[PDB]
Paper text:
Transmission of the New World hemorrhagic fever arenaviruses Junín virus (JUNV) and Machupo virus (MACV) to humans is facilitated, in part, by the interaction between the arenavirus GP1 glycoprotein and the human transferrin receptor 1 (hTfR1). Each non-covalently associated protomer of the trimeric GP consists of a myristoylated stable signal peptide (SSP), a GP1 receptor-binding glycoprotein, and a membrane-anchored GP2 fusion glycoprotein. Crystallographic investigation of the Fab fragments of NAb MAC1 and a representative JUNV-specific NAb, JUN1, in complex with their cognate GP1 antigens reveals that both NAbs target the TfR1 binding site.
Recombinant JUNV GP1 was complexed with the Fab fragment of NAb JUN1, partially deglycosylated with endoglycosidase F1 (endoF1), and crystallized using the sitting drop vapor diffusion method. Fab JUN1 binds to JUNV GP1 at a site overlapping that used for TfR1 recognition through the use of all six complementarity-determining regions (CDRs), in an extensive interaction that occludes approximately 1,550 Å2 of solvent-accessible surface area. Within the CDR H3 loop, the side chain of Tyr100A (Chothia numbering scheme) inserts into the pocket and interacts with Ser111 and Asp113 at the tip of the third β-strand of the JUNV GP1. Moreover, this mode of tyrosine-mediated GP1 engagement is highly reminiscent of the insertion of Tyr211 from hTfR1 in the MACV GP1-hTfR1 complex, the only structurally characterized NW GP1-host receptor complex to date. Residues Gln27CDR L1 to Ser32CDR L1 also provide substantial contacts with loop 3 of JUNV GP1, including hydrogen bonding between Ile28CDR L1 and Tyr122JUNV GP1. Electron density corresponding to at least one well-ordered GlcNAc moiety was observed at Asn166 and Asn178 but not at Asn95 and Asn105 in the structure of JUNV GP1-Fab JUN1.
Author numbering:
A (entry chain B): 0 to 213
B (entry chain A): -2 to 52, 52A, 52B, 52C, 53 to 82, 82A, 82B, 82C, ...
C (entry chain C): 87 to 228
The structure:
């Protein structure tokens, strides 16, 4: 019974100076009672347009919106680096006020191979009884990537935790960290630990290794 | 300058389930009594959801709430103090989000609930977990791999609660080529890592220290990264 | 007591009755939508439009003044009093489609109500009238 606002494209890749349109779909007819907002890095949103097509006073000339019924689109012309942000719609025609799923605006760039670095458990953590192996994949593009953990050549997929960064604002790349946590007893039992990173940039995955004996 | 500041009156953002938390949003740079005020919470990785609204003094300070929140929250305002408040009772773990206060004015001559200005937001987490300080662990290569033109060092913080922590390198003087990854929550514990890439000539030639701060546990730790030996 | 109406700058129409004062405007913005808003097909249904009897009476007075037939003319909309956006009611005044005859009678009613009435509604374009509360201007007759 509540109008939902769905955005078909969760992510959109663009370049500076290009034209980009973000579509908002409403589960029910909301007429002209639609606003658009902009949000960066989870900070406070900023109102862009209201009444489907009325630009806010602070908003620059590049942003233009339109639509009626259940289909509303927001277009940005001559996109700048400062325009890279999140954009979501909102309806205020009926209670409760509902917002869109969201679209992230990302900058295109050339493909970058991930720099892979493996790190053994530290001495301080070993005295505590735990052993965590961390693998860093830094400054790669495109966004797609995947990792594998091999312990003495055998794949390990138990205590692995991953974390992905957003697109870096300086060089437009992505990064990822993978951590394999094990107890001190099971860590000392094995000798070889490797993390294999798979990316579009290479047909063969990147491999980094450290041996406990060496 | 139409500034909206959000603060927490009691304690901090972390609260236990079933406890009560009161959010206060103070405005400035405009006439608070003229406009209506809304409260909005954004769950992590979820769309923004409206919570409540309170109208001006011309109307009898009427308010409207959402169904999930009815009977648990109460919105209020003080024109003299020029501030809007949100009192939250019987908090459930679902209520974990970043809460925003917003102002709605008149658009093309008609009252609408588009949000003019917003507060900075306060992170509110509700869980049964307790406060715990982090463990800082250095991450060094160990000279078991070939050294290139650039060397990547790392820092690992483990077992802290709640969010957040502050990770810097060399007291912030080293900010180029630094990646601090978002934390991961497992077994009511947060664990994150941070990488730093410096020229291979600079390390271990020069000192590289990792600075971690966790205010909830009064934890300030500096860990120097040294090469591994045997 | 008779409601008094004053026009300022020949673009906006203000009507004051009792303790209630409204401002009438014309544009294509559909502030009220029939799906989510109250339908006024009978004059007694206007109790849902406001919590103040003055606004209800003044609203009913205005539609009687322009010649609105509550049972023959298209019903108009008003915001549910439980909502907090504020009082407002909206009449479709667009001179197009099946609403042509009603839109033409509305123009006649306004021309007899206000001596100087600028018909913003143009043939073939959507035109929606909206009356909302406003502070009574001190620069117009009392
Ligand atoms: C006001 O009335 C006009 C005319 O009756 C409506 O406009 C028409 O609505 C029908 C609905 O089926 C459409 O098929 C026509 O294409 C519309 N005409 C134009 C020119 O757009 C209008 O929708 C009404 N507005 C409201 C808020 O009820
Ligand atoms: C106005 O709102 C109340 C509660 O939200 C509802 O019970 C009532 O039916 C609404 N009015 C109309 C005419 O639907």
């Amino acid at each position: 019974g509540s109008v939902v606002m769905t955005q078909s494209q969760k992510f959109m890749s663009t370049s500076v100076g290009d034209r980009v349109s973000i579509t908002c779909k409403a589960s029910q007819i909301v007429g002209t009672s639609v606003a658009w907002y902009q949000q960066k890095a989870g900070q406070s949103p900023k109102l862009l347009i209201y009444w489907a097509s009325t630009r806010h006073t602070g908003v620059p000339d590049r942003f233009t919106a339109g639509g009626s019924g259940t289909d509303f689109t927001l277009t940005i012309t001559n996109v700048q680096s400062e325009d890279l942000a999140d954009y979501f719609c909102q309806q205020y025609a009926t209670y409760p006020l509902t917002f869109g799923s969201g679209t992230k605006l990302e900058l295109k760039r050339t493909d970058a191979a991930p720099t892979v670095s493996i790190f053994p458990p530290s001495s301080e953590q070993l005295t505590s009884g735990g052993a965590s192996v961390v693998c860093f994949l830094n400054n790669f593009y495109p966004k797609d990537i995947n990792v594998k953990w091999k312990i003495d050549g055998s794949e390990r997929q138990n205590g692995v935790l991953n974390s992905w960064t957003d697109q870096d604002s300086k060089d437009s790349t992505y990064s990822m960290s993978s951590t394999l946590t094990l107890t001190k007893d099971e860590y000392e039992r094995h000798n070889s630990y490797t993390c294999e990173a798979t990316h579009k940039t290479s047909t063969s995955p990147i491999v980094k290794s450290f041996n406990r004996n060496e | 300058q139409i500034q909206l500041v959000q603060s927490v009156e009691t304690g901090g953002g972390l609260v236990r389930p079933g406890n009560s938390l009161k959010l206060s949003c103070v405005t400035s740079g405009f006439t608070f009594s003229n406009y209506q005020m809304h409260w909005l919470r954004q769950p992590p990785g979820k769309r923004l959801e409206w919570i409540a609204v309170i109208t001006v003094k011309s109307d009898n300070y009427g308010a409207n709430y959402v169904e999930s929140v009815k009977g648990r929250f109460a919105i209020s305002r003080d024109d003299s103090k020029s501030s809007v408040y949100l009192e939250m009772n019987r908090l459930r773990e679902e209520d974990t989000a970043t809460y925003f206060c917003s102002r709605s004015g008149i658009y093309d001559g008609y009252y609408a609930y588009a949000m003019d200005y917003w507060g900075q937001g306060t992170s509110v987490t509700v869980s049964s977990a307790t406060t715990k300080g982090p463990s800082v662990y250095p991450l060094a290569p160990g000279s078991a791999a070939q050294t290139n033109s650039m060397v990547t060092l790392g820092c690992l913080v483990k077992g802290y609660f709640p969010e957040p922590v502050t990770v810097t390198w060399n007291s912030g003087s080293l900010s180029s080529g630094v990646h601090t990854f978002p934390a991961v929550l497992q077994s009511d514990l947060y664990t994150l890592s941070s990488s730093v890439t410096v020229p291979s000539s600079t390390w271990p030639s020069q000192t590289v220290t990792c600075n971690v701060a966790h205010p909830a546990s009064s934890t300030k730790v500096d860990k120097k990264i040294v090469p591994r030996d045997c | 007591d008779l409601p008094l109406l004053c026009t300022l700058n020949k673009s906006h129409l203000y009507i004051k009755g009792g303790n209630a004062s409204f401002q009438i405007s014309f544009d294509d913005i559909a502030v009220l939508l029939p799906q989510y808003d109250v339908i006024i097909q009978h004059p007694a249904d206007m109790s849902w439009c406001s919590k103040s009897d003055d606004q209800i009476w003044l609203s009913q007075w205005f539609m009687n003044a322009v010649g609105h037939d509550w049972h023959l003319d298209p019903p108009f909309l008003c915001r549910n009093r439980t909502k907090t956006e504020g009082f407002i009611f909206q009449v479709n005044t667009s001179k197009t489609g099946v609403n042509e005859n009603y839109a033409k009678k509305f123009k006649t009613g306004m021309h007899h109500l206000y001596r100087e009435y600028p018909d913003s509604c143009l043939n073939g374009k959507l035109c929606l009238m909206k009356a909302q509360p406003t502070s009574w201007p001190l620069q117009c007759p009392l």
